[PDB]
């Protein structure tokens, strides 16, 4: 089954664009990345950076995750991100999202050898 690292990349990485190009970015990406298949995922963040730059966060500033786990890390730098969260009209299977552009630090949880992101915890 899909590894946690691979699921992180599918859910959260978008190295192919520098930022969201339109209000329909989230609608399209949430669909394309299969985050609407079984239910409407309520909130999601995409990171517009190289994969290596995001993986490198696992060697940056340690911080406890929202859930208290201690394997979370904050990026030293801000990153281009897109926040996606459901609109009031979102109704499965017609999932609908608001796209918001931002430049923020990210917080990810890391696991494994190589030690890589497995969960997107927050934009801050």
Curated annotation (Swiss-Prot):
Active-site positions on this chain: 12 (proton acceptor), 119 (proton donor)
Enzyme Commission number(s) from the entry: 4.6.1.18
Example of a GO biological process term: defense response to Gram-positive bacterium
EC class name: lyase
Residue intervals passing through the bilayer: none
Keywords for this protein: Disulfide bond, Endonuclease, Glycation, Glycoprotein, Hydrolase, Lyase, Nuclease, Secreted, Signal
Catalytic reaction equation(s): an [RNA] containing cytidine + H2O = an [RNA]-3'-cytidine-3'-phosphate + a 5'-hydroxy-ribonucleotide-3'-[RNA]; an [RNA] containing uridine + H2O = an [RNA]-3'-uridine-3'-phosphate + a 5'-hydroxy-ribonucleotide-3'-[RNA]
GO MF annotation terms: lyase activity; nucleic acid binding; ribonuclease A activity; RNA nuclease activity
Annotated tissue distribution: Pancreas.
Result after altering residue 12 to A: Loss of activity
GO cellular component: extracellular region
UniProt-annotated binding residues for substrate: 7, 10, 41-45, 66, 85
Disulfides per UniProt: 26-84, 40-95, 58-110, 65-72
Glycosylated residues in this chain: 1, 7, 34, 37, 41
Compartment(s): Secreted
Main location: secreted
Oligomer and partners: Interacts with and forms tight 1:1 complexes with RNH1. Dimerization of two such complexes may occur. Interaction with RNH1 inhibits this protein. Monomer.
Family per similarity comment: Belongs to the pancreatic ribonuclease family.
Function: Endonuclease that catalyzes the cleavage of RNA on the 3' side of pyrimidine nucleotides. Acts on single-stranded and double-stranded RNA.
Name of the featured protein: Ribonuclease pancreatic
UniProt source species: Bos taurus (Bovine)
Originating gene: RNASE1
């Amino acid at each position: 089954k899909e590894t946690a690292a691979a699921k992180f990349e599918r859910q959260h990485m978008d190295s192919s664009t520098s930022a969201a190009s339109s209000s329909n970015y989230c609608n399209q990406m949430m669909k394309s990345r299969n985050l609407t298949k079984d239910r409407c995922k309520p909130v999601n963040t995409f990171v517009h950076e190289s994969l290596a730059d995001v993986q490198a966060v696992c060697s940056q500033k340690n911080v406890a995750c929202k859930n208290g786990q201690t394997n979370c890390y904050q990026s030293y730098s801000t990153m281009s991100i897109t926040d996606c969260r459901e609109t009031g009209s979102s109704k499965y299977p017609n999932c609908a999202y608001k796209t918001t552009q931002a430049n923020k630090h990210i917080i990810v949880a890391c696991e494994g050898n190589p030690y890589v992101p497995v969960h997107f915890d927050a934009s801050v």
